[PDB]
Symmetry: C2
Subunit: 316 residues, 2 copies
């Protein structure tokens, strides 16, 4: 009737009486949704057990630890045993919530972190895990889906800059198809992936697309023109490196190339003179600039390429 | 060899040869991803069929309708029968896309409407719906998860203003649990929903919660103090209306109340004078203001209630 209001983990509040009762203990009052829960503690700091019974004989039990460092809120059906919901909170939430179905079986679990990381686990009518939503502080995401065989059937990975990774899984739960949408809407598509992770690959750029294969730790993309093969390689890391071979054997026309990962530039040489620099830009575009008749300095401006034809023209 | 470019549905380009080929027909060129497609048409406008073979013998077929109003893009495996992918675009995107597994069965289907809108659909083992994502033009997204019988298992709706509806379904795919989160963070939840819509309902406001019942047409939330019941009804749509009954028989003390929906104000009367205005606001708060001793005008300011007890003091 006169006493203090302490705060509790979860932004809940408890009023403790500052004067004992018959048994030397202290009265607790707290309002869960619309019920006024009450209890008795030896302690006088707001810790203890509070219980209440709903208009529909539904039991509510609220436990606060000695050091006010944890709260458990349990709701039971009218038989005081099979539960409706369970919420556990420390600091600074740090949280775990559980909703059960009308049957007392678990329907979903939400684990919420201090930084505000979610892991959402949802459970199906058979008691298995159907899907999972992971969210980390920066809002980047993982949506995982499962099937009868207790394996992945689909996964979407989002990053706050839009960029995503889209995956589909085969009969045995092995990856068979992957689509990586970049920042700028450029895409890498992987198809027919095998148990050993080999497959077909395809890079969709602005106005043209490059094709090739998937292996071990790399993707190899290839453009052919007469006797020349230009290769773009993307490693496990996402390391881009470029190479060129020419089967033509006459030192007058044979192209040879040098790659410089520092500047992301492939330099083509013919007849001991530099001819072109191909630049692989951080905007997932290629540019092409020619050198002088000396092959010592670059002339004009770098030219942004539009279509596979122009890539082939620089290889001619 | 080549002479005149034409633009096509689904951001493509065809090179039609001005003047006939070797037989009155016209030669056509288009580049689908990394492949040169070639064809011959009667018409010289950019219409016709273009085929080609990938390096892995997969076959590509581009069909452009005679008026340039439909394109059809298809990829087969070697064998030219079992499809890899099928895109059909029109005026003006307006497009459906389809992807098939290694067996030629359908894996996903993306339909994108003219107004940038889109339904996405994912399939399982016996080619039936696992999930659907429907995104309307104004961003509003809808996620639908189906159980292994193709009844609903989970549904999530996010409106343009971040307000949402979260729904869970039972073994018969009837709704059992509904969570409406409003734009302001307040919530309406409904549990144990039966096959006729009835259930328990809660409204989580800032500081307190009101409890009561759901019915085929309406929510009814109920606070009692002594002989008096105050009822908040939220409708089929979402119209709030409030009513008050007092079982008290003495005219000296019995409350009666007038609802005024245009102002969202409940006015309580006792002994033929007005006493209080409960005002239900568009911020989902309640406020109380007393009348002067005449019961003819309002004294002081309106006070915002922060907990249930207060509503209940108001009702004494």
């Amino acid at each position: 009737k006169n006493s203090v209001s302490v705060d509790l983990p979860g932004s809940m509040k408890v009023l403790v009486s500052k004067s004992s009762n018959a048994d030397g203990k202290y009265d607790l009052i707290a309002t869960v949704d619309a019920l006024e829960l009450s209890g008795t503690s030896d302690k006088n700091n707001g810790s203890g057990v509070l219980e209440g019974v709903k208009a529909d004989a539904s039991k509510v039990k609220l436990t606060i630890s000695d050091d006010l460092g944890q709260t458990t809120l349990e709701v039971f059906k009218s038989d005081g045993s099979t539960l409706v919901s369970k919420k556990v909170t420390s600091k600074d939430k740090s949280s775990t919530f559980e909703l059960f179905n009308e049957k007392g079986e678990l329907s979903f679990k939400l684990i919420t972190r201090a930084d505000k990381s979610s892991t959402f686990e949802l459970f199906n009518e058979k008691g298995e895990l159907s899907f999972k939503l992971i969210t980390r502080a920066d809002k980047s995401s993982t949506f995982e889906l499962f099937n009868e065989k207790g394996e992945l059937s689909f996964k979407l990975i989002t990053r706050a800059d839009k960029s995503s990774t889209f995956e589909l899984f085969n009969e045995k739960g092995e990856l068979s198809f992957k689509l990586i949408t970049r920042a700028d809407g450029t895409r890498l598509e992987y198809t027919g992936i095998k148990s050993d992770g080999s497959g077909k690959a395809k890079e969709v750029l602005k106005g043209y697309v490059l094709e090739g294969t998937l292996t071990a730790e790399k993707t190899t993309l290839v453009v052919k023109e007469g006797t020349v093969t230009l290769s773009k390689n993307i490693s496990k890391s996402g390391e881009v490196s470029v190479e060129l071979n020419d089967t033509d054997s006459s030192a007058a026309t044979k192209k040879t190339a040098a790659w410089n990962s520092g500047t992301s530039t492939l330099t083509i040489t013919v007849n001991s003179k530099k001819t072109k620099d191909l630049v692989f830009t951080s905007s997932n575009t290629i540019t092409v600039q020619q050198y002088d008749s000396n092959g010592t300095s670059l002339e004009g401006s770098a030219v942004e390429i539009t279509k596979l034809d122009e890539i082939k023209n620089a290889l001619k």
